[PDB]
Amino acid sequence: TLNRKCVVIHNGSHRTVAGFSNVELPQCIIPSSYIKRTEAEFIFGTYNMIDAAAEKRNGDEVYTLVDSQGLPYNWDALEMQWRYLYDTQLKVSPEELPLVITMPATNGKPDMAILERYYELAFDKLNVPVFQIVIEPLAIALSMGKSSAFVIDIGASGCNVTPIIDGIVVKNAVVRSKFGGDFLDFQVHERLAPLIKEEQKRSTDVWYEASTWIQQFKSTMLQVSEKDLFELERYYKEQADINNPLVQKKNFLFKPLNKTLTLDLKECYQFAEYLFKPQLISDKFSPEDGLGPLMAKSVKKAGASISPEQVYSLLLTNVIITGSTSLIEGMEQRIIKELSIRFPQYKLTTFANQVMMDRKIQGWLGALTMANLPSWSLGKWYSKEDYETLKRD
Amino acid sequence: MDPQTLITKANKKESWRYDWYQPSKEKYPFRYKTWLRNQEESCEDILDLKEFDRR
Amino acid sequence: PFRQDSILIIYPRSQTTLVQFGLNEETFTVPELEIPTQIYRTTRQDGSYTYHSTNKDNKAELIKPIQNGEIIDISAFTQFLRLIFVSILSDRANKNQDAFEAELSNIPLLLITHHSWSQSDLEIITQYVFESLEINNLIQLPASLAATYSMISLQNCCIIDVGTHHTDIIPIVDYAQLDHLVSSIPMGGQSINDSLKKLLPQWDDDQIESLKKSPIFEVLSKNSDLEFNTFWDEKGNEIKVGKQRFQGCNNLIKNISNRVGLTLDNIDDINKAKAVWENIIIVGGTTSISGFKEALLGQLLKDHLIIEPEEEKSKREEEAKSFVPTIEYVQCPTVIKLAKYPDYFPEWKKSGYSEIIFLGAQIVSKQIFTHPKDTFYITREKYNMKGPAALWDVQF
Amino acid sequence: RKKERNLHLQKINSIIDFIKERQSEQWSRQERCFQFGRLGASLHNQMEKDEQKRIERTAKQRLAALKSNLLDQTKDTRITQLLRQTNS
Numbered sequence: 058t059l060n061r062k063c064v065v066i067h068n069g070s071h072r073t074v075a076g077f078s079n080v081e082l083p084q085c086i087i088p089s090s091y092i093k094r095t096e097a098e099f100i101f102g103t104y105n106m107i108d109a110a111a112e113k114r115n116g117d118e119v120y121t122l123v124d125s126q127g128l129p130y131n132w133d134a135l136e137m138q139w140r141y142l143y144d145t146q147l148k149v150s151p152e153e154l155p156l157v158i159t160m161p162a163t164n165g166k167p168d169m170a171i172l173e174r175y176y177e178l179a180f181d182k183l184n185v186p187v188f189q190i191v192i193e194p195l196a197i198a199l200s201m202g203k204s205s206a207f208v209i210d211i212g213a214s215g216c217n218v219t220p221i222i223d224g225i226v227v228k229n230a231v232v233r234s235k236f237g238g239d240f241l242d243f244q245v246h247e248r249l250a251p252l253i254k255e256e257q258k259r260s261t262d263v264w265y266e267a268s269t270w271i272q273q274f275k276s277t278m279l280q281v282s283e284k285d286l287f288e289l290e291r292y293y294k295e296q297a298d299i300n301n302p303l304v305q306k307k308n309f310l311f312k313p314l315n316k317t318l319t320l321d322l323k324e325c326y327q328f329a330e331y332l333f334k335p336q337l338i339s340d341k342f343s344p345e346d347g348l349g350p351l352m353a354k355s356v357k358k359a360g361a362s363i364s365p366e367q368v369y370s371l372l373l374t375n376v377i378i379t380g381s382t383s384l385i386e387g388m389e390q391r392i393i394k395e396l397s398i399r400f401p402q403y404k405l406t407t408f409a410n411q412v413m414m415d416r417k418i419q420g421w422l423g424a425l426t427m428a429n430l431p432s433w434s435l436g437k438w439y440s441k442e443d444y445e446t447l448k449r450d
Numbered sequence: 451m452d453p454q455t456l457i458t459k460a461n462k463k464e465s466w467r468y469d470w471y472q473p474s475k476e477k478y479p480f481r482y483k484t485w486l487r488n489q490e491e492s493c494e495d496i497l498d499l500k501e502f503d504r505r
Numbered sequence: 506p507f508r509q510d511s512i513l514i515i516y517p518r519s520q521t522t523l524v525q526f527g528l529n530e531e532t533f534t535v536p537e538l539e540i541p542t543q544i545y546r547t548t549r550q551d552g553s554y555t556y557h558s559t560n561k562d563n564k565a566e567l568i569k570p571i572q573n574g575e576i577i578d579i580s581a582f583t584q585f586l587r588l589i590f591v592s593i594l595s596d597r598a599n600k601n602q603d604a605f606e607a608e609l610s611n612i613p614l615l616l617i618t619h620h621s622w623s624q625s626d627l628e629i630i631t632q633y634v635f636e637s638l639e640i641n642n643l644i645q646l647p648a649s650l651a652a653t654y655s656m657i658s659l660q661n662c663c664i665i666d667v668g669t670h671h672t673d674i675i676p677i678v679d680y681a682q683l684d685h686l687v688s689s690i691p692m693g694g695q696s697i698n699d700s701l702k703k704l705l706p707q708w709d710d711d712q713i714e715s716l717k718k719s720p721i722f723e724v725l726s727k728n729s730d731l732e733f734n735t736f737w738d739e740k741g742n743e744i745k746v747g748k749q750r751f752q753g754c755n756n757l758i759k760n761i762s763n764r765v766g767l768t769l770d771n772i773d774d775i776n777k778a779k780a781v782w783e784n785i786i787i788v789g790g791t792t793s794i795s796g797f798k799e800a801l802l803g804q805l806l807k808d809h810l811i812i813e814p815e816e817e818k819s820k821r822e823e824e825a826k827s828f829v830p831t832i833e834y835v836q837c838p839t840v841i842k843l844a845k846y847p848d849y850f851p852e853w854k855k856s857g858y859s860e861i862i863f864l865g866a867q868i869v870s871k872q873i874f875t876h877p878k879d880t881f882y883i884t885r886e887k888y889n890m891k892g893p894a895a896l897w898d899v900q901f
Numbered sequence: 902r903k904k905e906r907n908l909h910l911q912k913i914n915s916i917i918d919f920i921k922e923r924q925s926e927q928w929s930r931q932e933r934c935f936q937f938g939r940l941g942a943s944l945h946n947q948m949e950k951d952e953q954k955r956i957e958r959t960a961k962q963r964l965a966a967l968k969s970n971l972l973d974q975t976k977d978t979r980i981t982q983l984l985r986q987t988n989s
């Protein structure tokens with residue numbers, strides 16, 4: 058319809074996705090972090106950072122670009138990252154093409170602070186011809202053809218739950234669990250460390266391991282128990298007295314040491330259970346912090362923010378299971394089970410894109426999608442006048 | 451052999467240009483560059499093939 | 506449509522470019538034109554510039570539009586291209602008085618696109634195709650895409666593109682190119698020469714270069730049965746050499762495999778990833794060196810094959826010796842394999858397949874230009890409808 | 902108030918409507934290359950078939966010439982092998 062195309066940038070907590078609105082797949086995806094070298098040198102790029110890791114130069118440091126809130130952290134570095142993309146991946150002056158970016162749903166408290174900083178970057182530093190920012194979970198629901206949706210972000214750096222009612226992000230009901238991908242990565246590392254040779258530059262290496270073999274492990278070794286592992290285990294023992302798959306072994310080669318690691322099914326399940334029963338992690342966590350009750354909490358809070366009976370029937374029939382972590386086999390079904398436990402009186406309808414690729418970049422695809430609408434004026438497009446207004450006294 | 455006229459003979463049409471453009475509903479306070487249907491030296495010689503043939 | 510003799514396929518590269526105007530109708534053949542990718546630039550009063558096929562009055566500068574596969578000066582590039590197109594126009598026009606009554610009438614243009622070109626680069630290029638060369642039939646194929654047809658069409662496969670100063674790593678999944686994984690290494694055939702110079706610092710660079718080209722040079726794993734052998738120089742000299750003729754390749758190969766592993770490890774659908782690993786395709790002039798492809802396979806094999814680590818396997822066997830079921834893993838690849846070549850192109854069979862990517866383009870070219878629909882290319886109409894942007898309507 | 906919500910509701914309605922439109926309209930990079938492969942394969946079938954016919958025709962012509970008086974080279978090296986056995 059319209060004579061345009063644009064740059065879409067999604068600063069995820071782990072992956073930064075960027076590309077052109079012209080295409081289905083992103084132009085490139087790089088880690089949302091960088092290597093600082095010393096004079097001041099900034100390394101961006103998946104392979105580049107890997108090569109830097111291979112160098113193992115003293116003084117190299119890993120810094121992330123996104124904080125716990127899903128917001129930009131080191132703004133000066135952010136400039137450098139985007140600059141990098143414009144020069145080496147997009148390969149176009151930031152002044153010529155339009156820029157659409159996004160962010161996760163928040164409670165609204167930092168909205169103004171973030172926009173100020175973006176106006177400084179986009180306009181004061183990059184002279185971006187036009188600027189827009191959108192909400193990721195909102196975009197996802199919209200790409201699914203949903204006006205109302207229960208967005209379940211089983212991703213890294215925490216689990217986001219966003220109740221969307223009639224195109225409304227219920228900010229009061231939006232919750233951000235501290236548990237997610239990153240947590241599990243930590244646990245995997247710690248649980249497998251007992252089988253690995255020995256059991257900050259070091260932290261740069263941690264990043265390397267996280268970006269490599271750890272990610273490989275979690276892609277296939279983890280699996281989510283259908284039922285509550287504890288009860289399910291008991292069940293099988295009962296049945297044994299009256300086959301029990303929990304004893305089944307799985308194999309995984311530890312590439313860097315060339316050795317076979319072997320785990321049973323139960324152990325794989327044990328990792329998954331941390332997202333449902335965090336009180337099994339330690340005494341610092343409450344049963345309510347598991348995804349089951351967190352979801353219920355956010356559902357109920359959503360009801361509180363506006364006819365609970367209808368709200369529950371609405372959200373529970375528009376459930377979107379997404380985020381990269383959601384790809385762990387069985388996760389989807391387990392979510393369904395948890396929902397039926399806490400809402401046994403409601404029919405559940407969930408959605409999940411079977412294509413792995415689509416989920417991994419779904420947030421970007423959502424942004425992509427919104428960026429491609431013909432009624433230009435629907436967005437809150439920003440210009441220098443908005444930066445000016447902000448700074449005008 | 452004038453290569454330009456060879457072009458005019460070969461393969462026998464609105465041109466576009468890359469330039470600034472202002473969005474409108476009305477007009478919005480911003481502009482961007484794109485391929486606009488526009489308003490409406492060279493190599494100078496010809497390469498001696500036979501020198502560039504696989505023989 | 507379309508006349509076989511009017512279909513123009515152009516393949517650019519960092520060194521030279523292949524041009525093949527017209528097809529062989531019955532069969533496919535190896536591109537007969539080869540033109541050095543260089544053009545001269547004269548600086549005139551106040552920086553005004555001209556372009557030349559030669560160095561007019563020894564004042565023009567040597568310009569190389571393409572560097573490591575990437576266009577670094579699109580102005581120069583389109584001038585280079587222009588020169589080529591009109592060169593073949595005048596060539597045929599002189600060879601055939603009635604050329605514009607037939608073969609120089611409707612000319613299909615297939616340009617092979619190196620993945621490094623930007624979105625804006627591509628736009629400008631299509632602009633010149635229609636507004637400078639006035640060509641009413643344009644396809645800008647992904648080079649990797651062309652390659653996937655040549656290997657009897659593959660759904661899941663890898664393209665290893667060996668250049669001279671760079672090597673490109675491409676993964677194809679479901680026939681699509683995974684752009685966010687596609688990368689490139691700043692190493693190529695020249696690095697072989699560099700290491701050979703290091704190895705034999707007393708040799709002339711040409712001795713080294715011509716040796717690389719020579720059949721005595723080989724990647725190992727009957728000149729291999731001799732301690733010494735010889736090769737005739739460009740000047741007719743007899744060059745004698747020992748086992749150094751089998752050296753200088755591992756550095757390149759190792760770096761290739763490093764990125765191959767890293768790239769393929771990021772494929773999301775492991776079922777498809779498994780399929781990808783069983784179809785590896787190797788292309789590039791340097792890959793013509795005997796044994797190269799096999800060595801590359803071998804290096805990839807030993808560094809990625811999922812198989813019970815040597816000793817552990819022997820421990821299964823050891824304990825058995827006192828049948829063990831296959832020790833399956835959730836990982837991949839379990840099978841690493843090179844893709845199978847087509848046996849239906851004798852000409853190319855005879856020439857070798859280092860330039861097979863052109864063949865793939867040739868094959869799909871007749872598939873496209875004998876088809877009743879124009880679904881996959883830019884017409885003057887489409888160009889009029891979208892401008893340069895039309896490319897992303899037909900983008901492959 | 903009421904109409905403000907209705908505005909929002911229709912705004913997001915139209916957003917979804919444009920999205921679901923494009924879901925059926927778009928046809929993406931992958932769609933092109935997938936169709937090209939299906940297309941190319943049929944080209945190979947016809948072109949491949951033609952090549953086979955040409956090879957057969959050449960073989961037939963050679964056979965006819967012999968009567969009047971891969972394997973085309975295998976028989977040369979085979980008969981040359983045997984020729985050499987007789988030459989030696």
Ligand SMILES: Nc1ncnc2c1ncn2[C@@H]1O[C@H](COP(=O)(O)OP(=O)(O)OP(=O)(O)O)[C@@H](O)[C@H]1O
Binds near residue numbers: 068071276381
């Ligand atoms: N095969 C896999 N299955 C499940 N999870 C995976 C897989 N591969 C990677 N992950 C996890 O997915 C993470 C990236 O996912 P994702 O981009 O959804 O998180 P994120 O988008 O950064 O989080 P946010 O959505 O808050 O930005 C990686 O950190 C990795 O830990």
